[PDB]
Every structure is written in C-alpha cells, then in structure tokens.
Coordinates of C-alpha atoms and ligand atoms in Angstrom, one line a residue:
Chain A
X8 CA 109.7 109.7 85.3
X9 CA 111.2 106.3 85.9
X10 CA 109.0 103.1 85.9
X11 CA 111.8 101.0 87.5
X12 CA 112.4 103.4 90.4
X13 CA 113.2 101.8 93.7
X14 CA 113.3 103.1 97.3
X15 CA 116.9 104.0 98.3
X16 CA 117.9 101.2 100.6
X17 CA 121.5 102.1 101.1
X18 CA 121.4 103.7 104.5
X19 CA 123.8 102.6 107.3
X20 CA 121.0 100.5 108.9
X21 CA 118.1 98.5 107.5
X22 CA 116.0 99.7 110.4
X23 CA 114.0 98.5 113.3
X24 CA 111.4 95.6 113.2
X25 CA 109.1 95.8 116.2
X26 CA 107.2 92.5 117.1
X27 CA 104.2 92.6 119.5
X28 CA 103.6 89.1 120.5
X29 CA 100.3 88.2 122.4
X30 CA 99.9 84.8 123.9
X31 CA 97.3 85.3 126.6
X32 CA 94.9 87.9 127.9
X33 CA 93.3 89.4 130.9
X34 CA 90.6 87.0 132.0
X35 CA 87.8 89.6 131.6
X36 CA 88.3 89.8 127.9
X37 CA 87.4 86.0 127.7
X38 CA 89.9 85.4 124.8
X39 CA 91.6 82.0 124.5
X40 CA 95.4 81.5 124.6
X41 CA 97.3 81.8 121.3
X42 CA 99.3 78.6 121.2
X43 CA 101.6 78.6 118.2
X44 CA 102.4 82.3 118.4
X45 CA 105.8 81.8 119.8
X46 CA 106.7 79.8 116.7
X47 CA 105.5 82.8 114.6
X48 CA 107.5 85.3 116.7
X49 CA 110.7 83.2 116.6
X50 CA 110.4 82.6 112.8
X51 CA 109.9 86.3 112.1
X52 CA 112.8 87.2 114.4
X53 CA 115.0 84.9 112.3
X54 CA 113.9 86.0 108.8
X55 CA 113.8 89.7 109.7
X56 CA 117.3 89.6 111.3
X57 CA 118.6 87.8 108.2
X58 CA 117.4 90.8 106.2
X59 CA 119.4 93.3 108.3
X60 CA 116.7 94.4 110.7
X61 CA 117.2 95.2 114.3
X62 CA 114.4 93.1 115.8
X63 CA 112.7 94.1 119.1
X64 CA 110.1 91.8 120.6
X65 CA 107.5 92.5 123.3
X66 CA 105.3 89.8 124.7
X67 CA 101.9 90.5 126.2
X68 CA 102.2 94.2 126.9
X69 CA 99.1 96.0 128.3
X70 CA 97.7 98.6 125.9
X71 CA 99.2 101.6 127.8
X72 CA 102.7 100.1 127.8
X73 CA 102.4 99.0 124.1
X74 CA 101.4 102.5 123.1
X75 CA 104.2 103.9 125.1
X76 CA 106.7 101.6 123.4
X77 CA 105.5 102.4 120.0
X78 CA 105.4 106.1 120.7
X79 CA 109.1 105.9 121.8
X80 CA 110.0 104.2 118.5
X81 CA 108.2 106.8 116.4
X82 CA 110.1 109.6 118.1
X83 CA 113.7 108.3 117.8
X84 CA 115.5 109.3 114.7
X85 CA 115.3 106.9 111.7
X86 CA 117.5 109.2 109.6
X87 CA 120.1 106.4 109.5
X88 CA 117.7 103.7 108.4
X89 CA 116.1 102.4 105.2
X90 CA 112.7 101.6 106.6
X91 CA 110.5 100.6 109.5
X92 CA 108.6 97.3 110.3
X93 CA 106.0 96.8 112.9
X94 CA 104.4 93.3 113.5
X95 CA 101.3 92.4 115.6
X96 CA 100.4 88.9 116.5
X97 CA 97.1 88.8 118.4
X98 CA 93.4 88.4 118.4
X99 CA 91.4 90.9 116.6
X100 CA 88.1 92.0 115.1
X101 CA 86.9 94.8 112.9
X102 CA 89.8 97.3 112.7
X103 CA 91.4 96.6 116.1
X104 CA 93.8 94.2 117.7
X105 CA 94.1 93.2 121.4
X106 CA 96.8 94.1 123.8
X107 CA 96.8 92.2 127.1
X108 CA 93.9 94.2 128.7
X109 CA 92.2 96.2 125.9
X110 CA 91.7 96.5 122.2
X111 CA 93.6 99.2 120.2
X112 CA 92.4 100.6 116.8
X113 CA 95.0 99.8 114.1
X114 CA 94.7 103.4 113.0
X115 CA 96.0 104.5 116.4
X116 CA 99.2 102.6 115.8
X117 CA 99.9 103.7 112.2
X118 CA 99.0 107.3 112.8
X119 CA 102.2 107.9 114.9
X120 CA 104.3 107.2 111.8
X121 CA 102.6 109.6 109.4
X122 CA 104.9 112.1 107.7
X123 CA 103.9 115.1 109.9
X124 CA 104.4 113.0 113.1
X125 CA 107.5 111.1 112.1
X126 CA 109.8 113.2 110.0
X127 CA 112.8 110.9 109.8
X128 CA 110.7 108.2 108.1
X129 CA 109.3 110.6 105.4
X130 CA 110.0 109.0 102.0
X131 CA 110.7 105.6 103.5
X132 CA 108.6 102.5 103.6
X133 CA 106.5 102.0 106.8
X134 CA 105.4 98.3 106.9
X135 CA 102.8 96.9 109.2
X136 CA 102.1 93.1 109.4
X137 CA 99.1 92.0 111.2
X138 CA 98.1 88.4 112.2
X139 CA 94.6 88.7 113.7
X140 CA 91.0 88.0 112.7
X141 CA 89.3 90.8 110.9
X142 CA 85.7 89.7 111.4
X143 CA 83.6 86.6 112.0
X144 CA 83.0 85.2 108.5
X145 CA 84.8 81.9 107.7
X146 CA 85.7 81.9 104.0
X147 CA 84.5 78.9 101.9
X148 CA 86.3 76.7 99.3
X149 CA 85.4 76.9 95.6
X150 CA 86.8 74.9 92.7
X151 CA 88.3 76.7 89.6
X161 CA 107.5 118.0 95.1
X162 CA 106.0 117.5 98.5
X163 CA 104.8 114.1 99.7
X164 CA 101.4 113.3 101.2
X165 CA 101.7 112.6 105.0
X166 CA 99.9 109.3 104.3
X167 CA 102.3 108.0 101.6
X168 CA 104.7 105.1 101.7
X169 CA 102.7 102.8 104.1
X170 CA 102.3 99.2 103.3
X171 CA 99.7 97.3 105.4
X172 CA 100.1 93.5 105.2
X173 CA 97.1 91.6 106.7
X174 CA 97.0 87.9 107.2
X175 CA 93.3 88.0 105.9
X176 CA 90.9 90.1 103.9
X177 CA 88.6 92.3 106.0
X178 CA 85.6 90.6 107.6
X179 CA 87.1 87.1 108.0
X180 CA 88.7 84.6 110.4
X181 CA 92.4 84.1 110.3
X182 CA 93.9 80.7 111.1
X183 CA 96.6 79.4 113.5
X184 CA 98.1 76.0 114.1
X185 CA 98.9 75.3 117.7
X186 CA 102.5 74.2 117.1
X187 CA 103.6 75.6 113.7
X188 CA 101.9 79.0 114.1
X189 CA 99.7 81.0 111.9
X190 CA 99.0 80.0 108.3
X191 CA 100.0 83.5 107.1
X192 CA 103.2 84.0 109.2
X193 CA 104.4 80.5 108.3
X194 CA 104.0 81.2 104.5
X195 CA 105.3 84.8 104.9
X196 CA 108.5 83.4 106.6
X197 CA 109.1 80.7 104.1
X198 CA 108.8 83.1 101.2
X199 CA 111.1 85.6 103.1
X200 CA 113.6 82.8 103.6
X201 CA 113.6 81.8 99.9
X202 CA 113.1 85.2 98.2
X203 CA 113.3 88.0 100.7
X204 CA 116.7 89.4 99.7
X205 CA 115.9 89.4 96.0
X206 CA 112.1 89.6 95.1
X207 CA 110.2 92.9 95.2
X208 CA 108.4 92.8 98.5
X209 CA 104.8 93.2 97.1
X210 CA 105.5 90.5 94.6
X211 CA 106.7 88.4 97.6
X212 CA 103.4 89.1 99.4
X213 CA 101.5 88.0 96.2
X214 CA 103.2 84.6 96.5
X215 CA 102.2 84.6 100.1
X216 CA 98.6 85.2 99.0
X217 CA 98.8 82.1 96.7
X218 CA 100.4 79.9 99.4
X219 CA 97.9 80.7 102.1
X220 CA 95.0 80.4 99.7
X221 CA 96.1 76.7 99.1
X222 CA 95.6 75.8 102.7
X223 CA 92.4 74.4 104.1
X224 CA 91.2 73.4 107.6
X225 CA 91.8 69.7 107.6
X226 CA 91.3 69.0 111.3
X227 CA 89.3 71.0 113.9
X228 CA 87.5 70.8 117.2
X229 CA 84.6 72.5 115.3
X230 CA 83.4 70.0 112.6
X231 CA 81.8 72.8 110.5
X232 CA 85.1 74.5 110.0
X233 CA 86.5 71.6 108.0
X234 CA 87.5 72.6 104.5
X235 CA 87.3 76.4 105.1
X236 CA 89.8 78.8 103.7
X237 CA 91.6 82.1 104.0
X238 CA 93.2 84.7 101.6
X239 CA 95.5 87.5 102.9
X240 CA 95.5 91.0 101.7
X241 CA 98.1 93.7 101.4
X242 CA 97.2 97.4 101.0
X243 CA 99.8 99.5 99.4
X244 CA 100.4 103.2 99.5
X245 CA 104.0 102.7 98.3
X246 CA 105.3 104.9 95.6
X247 CA 108.4 102.9 94.4
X248 CA 109.7 99.3 94.2
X249 CA 110.7 97.8 97.5
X250 CA 113.7 95.4 97.9
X251 CA 115.7 94.0 100.8
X252 CA 119.0 93.4 98.9
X253 CA 121.9 92.3 101.2
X254 CA 123.5 95.5 102.7
Chain B
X2 CA 93.1 74.5 113.6
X3 CA 92.4 77.6 115.7
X4 CA 91.5 81.1 114.9
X5 CA 92.5 84.7 115.8
Chain C
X7 CA 106.5 72.9 91.4
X8 CA 105.8 76.4 92.9
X9 CA 106.5 79.0 90.2
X10 CA 107.4 82.5 91.5
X11 CA 106.9 83.9 88.0
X12 CA 103.4 82.5 87.6
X13 CA 100.8 84.8 85.7
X14 CA 97.1 84.7 85.4
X15 CA 96.0 83.0 82.2
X16 CA 94.9 85.9 80.0
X17 CA 94.4 83.9 76.8
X18 CA 90.6 83.6 76.7
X19 CA 88.5 84.6 73.8
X20 CA 87.5 87.9 75.4
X21 CA 89.4 90.2 77.8
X22 CA 86.1 90.8 79.6
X23 CA 83.6 93.4 80.6
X24 CA 84.6 96.7 82.2
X25 CA 81.5 98.4 83.9
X26 CA 81.7 102.1 84.6
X27 CA 79.2 103.7 87.0
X28 CA 79.5 107.4 86.4
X29 CA 77.8 109.8 88.9
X30 CA 77.5 113.5 87.9
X31 CA 74.5 114.8 90.0
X32 CA 72.3 113.6 92.9
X33 CA 68.8 113.8 94.3
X34 CA 68.4 117.2 95.6
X35 CA 67.8 116.2 99.3
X36 CA 71.1 114.4 99.5
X37 CA 72.6 117.9 99.3
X38 CA 75.7 116.7 97.3
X39 CA 77.4 119.0 94.7
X40 CA 77.6 118.2 91.0
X41 CA 80.8 116.3 90.0
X42 CA 82.0 118.5 87.1
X43 CA 85.0 116.8 85.6
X44 CA 83.6 113.2 85.9
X45 CA 82.6 112.9 82.2
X46 CA 86.3 113.5 81.3
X47 CA 87.2 110.7 83.7
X48 CA 84.5 108.3 82.2
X49 CA 85.5 109.1 78.6
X50 CA 89.2 108.6 79.4
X51 CA 88.7 105.2 81.1
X52 CA 86.4 104.2 78.2
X53 CA 89.2 104.8 75.7
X54 CA 92.0 103.2 77.9
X55 CA 90.0 100.2 78.8
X56 CA 88.8 99.6 75.2
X57 CA 92.4 99.7 74.0
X58 CA 93.2 96.9 76.4
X59 CA 90.5 94.7 74.9
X60 CA 87.6 95.3 77.4
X61 CA 84.0 95.5 76.4
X62 CA 83.1 98.8 78.2
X63 CA 79.6 99.5 79.5
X64 CA 78.9 102.9 81.1
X65 CA 75.9 103.8 83.2
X66 CA 75.3 107.4 84.2
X67 CA 73.4 108.5 87.4
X68 CA 71.6 105.3 88.2
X69 CA 69.5 105.1 91.3
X70 CA 70.6 102.6 93.8
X71 CA 68.0 100.0 93.0
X72 CA 68.7 100.2 89.3
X73 CA 72.5 100.0 89.8
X74 CA 72.3 97.0 92.0
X75 CA 70.0 95.4 89.5
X76 CA 72.5 96.1 86.8
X77 CA 75.5 94.8 88.7
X78 CA 73.5 91.7 89.8
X79 CA 72.8 91.0 86.1
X80 CA 76.5 91.2 85.2
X81 CA 77.5 88.9 88.1
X82 CA 75.1 86.2 86.8
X83 CA 76.0 86.2 83.1
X84 CA 78.7 83.7 82.1
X85 CA 82.3 85.0 82.1
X86 CA 83.6 81.5 81.2
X87 CA 84.8 83.1 78.0
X88 CA 86.7 86.1 79.6
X89 CA 90.1 86.8 81.2
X90 CA 88.8 89.0 84.0
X91 CA 86.3 91.6 85.1
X92 CA 86.6 95.4 85.9
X93 CA 84.1 97.6 87.7
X94 CA 84.6 101.3 88.1
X95 CA 82.7 103.7 90.4
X96 CA 83.0 107.5 90.0
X97 CA 81.0 109.2 92.7
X98 CA 80.9 110.9 96.1
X99 CA 81.6 108.8 99.1
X100 CA 82.5 108.4 102.7
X101 CA 83.5 105.7 105.1
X102 CA 83.0 102.5 103.2
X103 CA 80.2 103.6 100.9
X104 CA 79.7 105.4 97.6
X105 CA 76.6 107.3 96.4
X106 CA 74.2 106.3 93.7
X107 CA 71.8 109.0 92.6
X108 CA 69.3 108.7 95.5
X109 CA 71.2 106.7 98.3
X110 CA 74.5 105.4 99.4
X111 CA 75.6 101.8 98.9
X112 CA 78.2 99.9 100.9
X113 CA 81.1 98.9 98.8
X114 CA 81.0 95.3 100.2
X115 CA 77.5 95.0 98.8
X116 CA 78.9 95.5 95.3
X117 CA 82.0 93.3 95.7
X118 CA 80.1 90.4 97.5
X119 CA 78.2 89.5 94.3
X120 CA 81.5 88.5 92.7
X121 CA 82.8 86.2 95.3
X122 CA 83.7 82.7 94.2
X123 CA 80.6 81.0 95.7
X124 CA 78.2 83.6 94.1
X125 CA 80.0 84.0 90.8
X126 CA 81.5 80.8 89.6
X127 CA 82.6 81.7 86.0
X128 CA 85.0 84.3 87.6
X129 CA 86.6 81.9 90.1
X130 CA 90.3 82.0 89.5
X131 CA 90.1 85.2 87.5
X132 CA 91.1 88.8 88.6
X133 CA 88.1 90.8 89.8
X134 CA 89.2 94.5 89.8
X135 CA 87.3 97.4 91.4
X136 CA 88.4 101.0 90.9
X137 CA 86.8 103.6 93.1
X138 CA 87.1 107.4 92.7
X139 CA 85.3 108.8 95.8
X140 CA 86.2 110.4 99.2
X141 CA 86.8 107.9 102.0
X142 CA 86.5 110.3 105.0
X143 CA 87.0 113.9 106.0
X144 CA 90.7 114.2 106.6
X145 CA 92.7 116.4 104.2
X146 CA 96.2 115.0 103.8
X147 CA 99.0 117.5 104.4
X148 CA 102.3 118.0 102.6
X149 CA 105.7 116.9 104.1
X150 CA 109.2 117.4 102.7
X151 CA 111.6 114.4 102.3
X152 CA 114.7 114.8 104.5
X160 CA 93.5 69.6 93.5
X161 CA 93.7 72.8 95.7
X162 CA 90.5 74.7 96.4
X163 CA 90.4 78.5 96.4
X164 CA 89.1 80.8 99.0
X165 CA 85.8 82.5 97.8
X166 CA 87.4 85.9 98.7
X167 CA 90.6 85.3 96.5
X168 CA 91.6 87.2 93.4
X169 CA 90.1 90.6 94.1
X170 CA 92.0 93.8 93.5
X171 CA 90.5 96.9 95.1
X172 CA 92.0 100.2 93.6
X173 CA 91.1 103.3 95.6
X174 CA 91.8 106.8 94.6
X175 CA 92.7 107.5 98.2
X176 CA 93.7 105.9 101.4
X177 CA 90.9 105.2 103.9
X178 CA 89.8 108.3 106.0
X179 CA 90.7 111.0 103.4
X180 CA 89.5 113.5 100.8
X181 CA 89.9 112.6 97.2
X182 CA 90.4 115.5 94.6
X183 CA 88.8 116.3 91.3
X184 CA 89.5 119.1 88.7
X185 CA 86.3 120.6 87.2
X186 CA 87.6 120.2 83.6
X187 CA 90.3 117.5 83.5
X188 CA 88.7 115.2 86.0
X189 CA 89.9 113.5 89.2
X190 CA 93.6 113.5 90.1
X191 CA 93.6 109.7 90.4
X192 CA 91.7 108.8 87.2
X193 CA 93.8 111.2 85.2
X194 CA 97.0 109.6 86.4
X195 CA 95.6 106.1 86.2
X196 CA 94.6 106.7 82.5
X197 CA 98.0 108.2 81.6
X198 CA 99.8 105.2 83.1
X199 CA 97.4 102.7 81.3
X200 CA 98.0 104.7 78.1
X201 CA 101.8 104.4 78.4
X202 CA 102.3 101.0 80.2
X203 CA 98.9 99.2 80.4
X204 CA 99.7 96.6 77.7
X205 CA 103.2 95.8 79.2
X206 CA 103.7 96.4 82.9
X207 CA 102.4 94.1 85.6
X208 CA 99.1 95.9 86.8
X209 CA 100.2 96.3 90.5
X210 CA 103.5 97.8 89.3
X211 CA 101.4 100.2 87.2
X212 CA 99.2 101.1 90.2
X213 CA 102.4 101.9 92.2
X214 CA 103.4 104.4 89.5
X215 CA 99.9 105.9 89.9
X216 CA 100.6 106.2 93.6
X217 CA 103.8 108.1 92.9
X218 CA 102.1 110.4 90.2
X219 CA 99.1 111.3 92.4
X220 CA 101.4 112.0 95.4
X221 CA 103.2 114.6 93.4
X222 CA 100.1 116.7 93.0
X223 CA 99.1 119.5 95.3
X224 CA 96.0 121.8 95.6
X225 CA 97.3 125.0 93.8
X226 CA 94.0 126.8 93.6
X227 CA 90.7 126.3 95.5
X228 CA 87.6 128.1 96.7
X229 CA 88.7 127.2 100.2
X230 CA 92.0 128.9 101.0
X231 CA 92.9 126.4 103.7
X232 CA 93.0 123.6 101.2
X233 CA 96.0 125.1 99.3
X234 CA 99.0 122.8 99.3
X235 CA 97.1 119.7 100.5
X236 CA 97.7 116.2 99.2
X237 CA 96.5 112.7 98.3
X238 CA 98.0 109.2 98.1
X239 CA 95.9 106.4 96.5
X240 CA 95.8 102.9 97.9
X241 CA 95.4 99.5 96.2
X242 CA 94.4 96.4 98.2
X243 CA 95.4 93.1 96.6
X244 CA 94.1 89.6 97.3
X245 CA 95.6 88.5 93.9
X246 CA 97.5 85.3 93.8
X247 CA 99.5 85.7 90.6
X248 CA 101.0 88.3 88.2
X249 CA 98.5 90.3 86.2
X250 CA 99.3 91.6 82.6
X251 CA 97.1 93.0 79.8
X252 CA 99.3 91.9 76.9
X253 CA 97.6 92.6 73.4
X254 CA 95.2 89.7 72.7
Chain D
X2 CA 90.0 122.0 93.1
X3 CA 87.1 120.1 94.5
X4 CA 86.5 117.0 96.5
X5 CA 84.4 113.8 96.3
Ligands
4HV1 C1 88.2 88.8 119.1 O1 87.5 87.9 119.9 C2 87.7 86.5 119.8 C3 88.9 86.0 119.3 C4 89.1 84.6 119.2 C5 88.1 83.8 119.7 C6 88.2 82.3 119.6 C7 89.0 81.5 118.9 C8 88.5 80.1 119.1 C9 89.1 78.9 118.5 O2 90.2 78.9 117.9 N1 88.5 77.7 118.8 C10 89.0 76.4 118.3 C11 89.4 75.3 119.4 O3 90.1 76.0 120.3 C12 87.8 75.8 117.6 C13 87.4 76.5 116.3 C14 86.2 77.2 116.2 C15 85.9 77.9 115.1 C16 86.7 77.9 114.0 C17 87.9 77.2 114.0 C18 88.7 77.1 112.8 N2 89.4 77.1 111.9 C19 88.3 76.5 115.2 C20 87.4 80.2 119.8 O4 87.2 81.5 120.1 C21 86.9 84.3 120.2 C22 86.7 85.7 120.3 O5 85.6 86.1 120.9 C23 84.7 85.2 121.5
4HV2 C1 79.6 112.3 101.0 O1 79.2 113.6 101.5 C2 79.8 114.8 100.9 C3 80.6 114.7 99.7 C4 81.2 115.8 99.2 C5 81.0 117.1 99.8 C6 81.6 118.3 99.4 C7 82.5 118.5 98.4 C8 82.8 120.0 98.4 C9 83.7 120.7 97.5 O2 84.3 120.2 96.6 N1 83.9 122.1 97.7 C10 84.7 122.9 96.9 C11 83.8 123.9 96.1 O3 84.5 124.3 94.9 C12 85.7 123.7 97.8 C13 86.5 122.8 98.7 C14 86.1 122.5 100.0 C15 86.9 121.7 100.8 C16 88.1 121.2 100.3 C17 88.5 121.5 98.9 C18 89.7 120.9 98.3 N2 90.6 120.6 97.8 C19 87.7 122.3 98.2 C20 82.0 120.5 99.4 O4 81.3 119.5 99.9 C21 80.2 117.1 101.0 C22 79.6 116.0 101.5 O5 78.9 116.1 102.7 C23 79.5 116.6 103.9

C-alpha cells in the first residue's frame, strides 16, 4: 500500500474538457442574462488547453441537446486518455443547473460517467466543475480488486450547498477567476485538490464591494470540492 | 456584483 | 504574499474536543435494526483521536432533543484555546439526515451551530464532521479497471462514509468498513500526513472492499466509495503537540 | 455484512 500513489497520467491524450456555457435563457424561465460568463469560458479554454485538454465548448444548448451531447461523449472511447473534465457555467438552485429552456439535475449529468455506464473511464478521474448558485442564502462575513462504480469522481463547486455564488459582469465569476489564476500558476505542478484548497482561500477573501442591492454589500462565498478520488491527481506536462 |  | 504551503495554526494549548455520537439501537416504532459493530467503531475512534491530542466525549443512544442540547452546549463553550473541533456520528441514515434514538435530524441542523456567525471561537479553525450512515438506497456495483473577512461557511470538512445516494456497510464484529479504514490510516499516518491526503487513502482502502458474505445473496460483490467535501482554506496536519 |  503506497501513500504517495498517483493516477497514471501517461496516456496518449490528456482527455476531453467539455464546457457548457449559458449566457441567456428562454423568457419563461425569467432568469437574467449572465454577463461575464464569456470571460469565464475563454479563461477556462485557455488554462485547460495549456494543460493538454481537448476543449469543446457549447453555448446556450437546450436541455435535450445538452444531454445528447453529453451522452455522446460518455459513449466514445476514452481508453486513450488520462481523464475527463466537464464544466457548467449557468444559473442553478438546489441540486440542478439550467440549460436554455429547462433545469437538469446534476446527478443526471454525472450518472452517465459511472463505471458501469462508461467503461473506458473506470480507474480515471472524472472531474465536474460547476459555477451556479446552490440555494438562496447569502453567506456573511466574520472576523478571525474491483472498484466501486461511483469511485474516482471529483465534484468542484463554486460554492457550498445552500448559497449564492457571485459573478462580475466583465471579469466573470469569482470562482472561475480564482480557479483559472491558480491553474495558470500551479496547474502543471500542484496536486489538483491542494490547488482547489488554494482556490477556496482566494474566493473566501473576496467580498461584495459594489452592488445594485445595498444589503448584499460585504457578503461572502466559500467554494467546496467533494472528492471520491482514490489517488493523487497531477497535470504534469505530457 | 451579480449572482447565479 | 500568498503562500501555497500555508497550514492551519495548530499550536494552541489544546488540540480540541472530539464528540462522538454513537447509536446502537432505536425506538421500536422507527423499525430500525440494531447496529452491531458500532461499539468497535466508537472505541477505535476514541483511541485514535485521543492519540492525536483530542479530548474525546462519547454519547450513546441520545434522543434527538438531548443530542441537540448537547451539541448546542459544545458550540457555545469557548474554543479560543483549541486547534480545531471534531464531531462524529455513527448511526442509520438516509437522504441528508441521520437518526438519533427516537427521530431523524437533518445534518445541516448539526453543522449550522458551528458556522462562523454562531460560533465565534471556532472562526478560522477546521470544523470536521465524520458521518457513518447510509445516504440513500442504491447499492454500488463492482467494475473492473481496463484585513480580510472570512465567509461564515468556511473551514468545514465533511467526511462521509459514502457518496450521496448509497448504502454504507458495517461488519457486525469489526465495525463499519469506513471507520475501520479511517482508524487504520489515522493509526499509521494521522500525526504526519495532511488530513485530506489521509482521507484519499481511506477512499482507496474502502473501495477495495467487497461484500463477501451477506444474508441477502444479491448484495454479494457490491461496493462502496466514501466522499469528503472540503471548504478548508489551508493544509491540515495533526503533528504531535 | 449489513447496512446503515
Ligand atoms: C435560479 O433562479 C435564479 C437565478 C438567478 C437570479 C437572479 C440573479 C440576480 C442578480 O444578480 N441581481 C443583481 C443585479 O442584476 C442584484 C443582486 C441581488 C442580490 C444579490 C446580489 C449579489 N451579490 C446582487 C437577480 O436574480 C434569480 C433567479 O430566480 C429569480
Ligand atoms: C434509515 O432507514 C433504514 C436504515 C437501515 C435499514 C436496513 C438495514 C438492513 C440490513 O443491514 N440488512 C442485512 C441483515 O443482516 C441484510 C442486508 C440487506 C441489504 C443489503 C445488505 C448488504 N450489504 C445486507 C436492513 O434494513 C432499513 C431502513 O429502512 C428502510
């Protein structure tokens, strides 16, 4: 048993990074436009490409087309790849995000990549990054062998469950900005979860300094990653 | 600031 | 300067309290079976956690109201003198709740008492919850590999024996898969490894297990992976004090 | 084996 064991990241390809980018929504949903999300998408495209990923972006898909796309990806072989990344930039609540015309349960998306559904990813990291609200609380400032089919998922959320997640209308989301900065500086050397912990510290330093809603001033946000990984994860240059 |  | 190596300060006078809520049996109407094996788990944690400096307090089979009373007391005592806080729950469970003796309790009810705006002497300090309970009714199957302010929600580490939606397993003599492997990894690496690194080892150990014998034949071969959810902002170690 |  080896405490330093790492995932084997010496396949021919790093793998695919899917980005689902949602800027606007069917009017009946009554959701506002997500100005700043294009910055987030472009930033991720750049950082993820630099780490060897084949980045595919889709903008404002309807739920049926998104599910179709994601179903396609989960059924092509990843035998040649180190890992898989899937990013969602949208509005959200509870345990769902919004496509153009309807909400989708996060579980619906991750389920397609479970071991018994997606064999060529068994034993490999399956990484989901979600920038969306997770509820309606606004956090406040304070002053200081076989494998399980569920294994090897890493869920990276911009915010802990129950809370608002923040976005600047030009620079993009707090979380994606800080994630991309840390990937830019440390992505090809730091263990990924340690990298995410740095992200938690960056984001938790931010505060709402300006807002159209005065009662939001000073409010806060901490991200949260949920790991079912079984080994150390690195993106060393290939 | 805006929210998601 | 931003320091990628930054650690929590773990040089206070006391490591801190570790509360263990141990549930073995339940009010008869709940119709929940006895959790044979759980005293092994409790005793094992008690020894590992004491060895790491914690002041261990166990409560067995409290009713909901008495448990919430107890946990409320702990959240209002000063922890100005402590490195961190640990709270362990060994019980039955589903969705996002666990059972006390007579009723279920939402996990968020328990964690909420320790948020920064409710528990000031723990602001800035790791708040670690370890939960051995089922999280749903799926049975996982085997597959073969081919100055700055702080948010009130910051600095929590939630360590679940299983991923959301699934059954969590227990042996009737040795205890739960998860707590056995967590204890072994604390035993071997607790006073040296970064704690999240340690939990990832626990993920790997538990995911090697399979149901080898079982009253229910269809359970044979089934599996379990744990999950930890981190809102920590720095590295966490339990070096000898 | 049993379950929780
Ligand atoms: C999932 O459903 C929703 C998602 C987002 C909004 C949403 C976002 C904003 C928003 O960003 N408003 C800005 C101005 O556009 C003002 C504001 C309000 C509250 C908190 C902050 C912060 N921080 C900012 C308003 O509604 C509303 C939803 O259901 C009604
Ligand atoms: C929170 O509610 C419940 C919690 C636990 C049980 C529960 C546990 C067991 C149990 O451990 N049964 C053992 C009796 O020895 C046989 C068994 C059954 C199913 C899966 C496995 C496995 N592995 C084992 C039966 O019910 C039932 C609940 O209500 C639906």
